[PDB]
Structures are given as C-alpha cells and as structure tokens.
Design a protein around this ligand. Structure first.
Ligand SMILES: C[C@@H]1[C@@H](C)C/C=C/[C@H](O)[C@@H]2CC[C@H]2CN2C[C@@]3(CCCc4cc(Cl)ccc43)COc3ccc(cc32)C(=O)NS1(=O)=O
Length: 155
C-alpha cells in the first residue's frame, strides 16, 4: 500500500520535526523526491496554519485535555467526527495534519514524546482509510505538492 506508507512517512516526519525542532537526516523510502517536496510543503503551509488559527487551536487543545496514552488513543474518534464527516479539500487535510503537529508539540512539553508516533499513525489511518478515493482522484502527494506550488517571482 504505497499511498499509506508514503502518507505515514510524511506525517510522522512532520510531527516529529515539529516536536523536536530537528530535521531527520535519513532518506525517504519509495517516491522520495515527492515525499521530500510534500514535507517541505507542510513546513511552509502547516506552520502558517498553526499561527493563523492559534486561538482556535489552543481552545481545542484545552477541550481535549491530553494527559496520557489513553487520551491520545481517543483522538481517532474525534478526527473521524470532525475531519472525515465533512467536505474534503487540501486545506482541510492541512488543518488535520497541522493540528496533529500542534498536539505533537504539546506531547513534547509534557514529556510524552513516545505517543507522537502512535498519533501520526492514527492521523494517517483516518486520512488514508477514509479519503482514499479522493486522494487518488487528486493525484495523491504529487497532487498535494502541485496544488501548493508557488512560482518564483520575477526580478
Ligand atoms: C476555519 C477552520 C480552521 C482552519 C481553524 C479552526 C478550526 C477548529 O476550531 C478546530 C481547531 C482544530 C480544529 C478541529 N479539527 C482538528 C481535528 C479534530 C480535533 C481532534 C484532532 C486531533 C488531531 Cl491529532 C488532528 C486533528 C484533529 C480534526 O482535523 C480537523 C480538520 C479540519 C478542520 C478542523 C479539524 C477544519 O475544516 N477546520 S476549518 O473549518 O477549516
């Protein structure tokens, strides 16, 4: 399942890099050129989302009250409720992943870094297993990179 594997790599890398502040130097697996560009795109776009929606992000983080492994496990149901049960567009997928990064950083602050990879798996499961048809029609991560590509300015 190439789409699942690629999605997990991108999402896991972004969440870990957001939590630790360090770039992972290891090569990507299959489709590395696209996965690298997808991760680079998340750095640009996801970082903006967390700031543009800081107040709402903080508000939802407080409502969720994430203290431990069991709380983190319970997020799958909430993601299905809020993300899956709505229109699909790339913006909503970026909000899903960006709020994931926001939660990952919270897990770093409460010294529960071990839950970051399980969290990335849960986000990936919700995205890929509930939106595969849409992702395939939109050209997967190649389409993500194309959608957010910005042309160089003249001069
Ligand atoms: C204008 C809206 C956002 C850009 C800004 C604020 C949004 C909301 O107040 C909540 C702050 C987190 C937002 C709720 N969740 C976040 C949520 C749902 C809450 C739990 C959760 C946990 C993780 Cl690890 C990742 C995502 C999530 C599901 O993903 C979302 C995807 C799209 C939208 C909202 C999502 C989503 O579509 N949000 S929106 O209508 O575009």
């Amino acid at each position: 399942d190439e789409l699942y594997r690629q999605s997990l790599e991108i999402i896991s890398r972004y969440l870990r890099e957001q939590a630790t502040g360090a770039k992972d130097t290891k090569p990507m697996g299959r489709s590395g050129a696209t996965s690298r560009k997808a991760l680079e795109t998340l750095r640009r776009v996801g970082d903006g989302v967390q700031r543009n929606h800081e107040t709402a992000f903080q508000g939802m983080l407080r409502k969720l009250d994430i203290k431990n492994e069991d709380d983190v496990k319970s997020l799958s149901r909430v993601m299905i409720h809020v993300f899956s049960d709505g229109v699909t567009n790339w913006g909503r997928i970026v909000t899903l992943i960006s709020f994931g990064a926001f939660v990952a950083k919270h897990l770093k602050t409460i010294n529960q870094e071990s839950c970051i990879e399980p969290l990335a798996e849960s986000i990936t499961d919700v995205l890929v297993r509930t939106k595969r048809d849409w992702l395939v029609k939109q050209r997967g991560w190649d389409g993500f990179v194309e959608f957010f590509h910005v042309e160089d300015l003249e001069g």
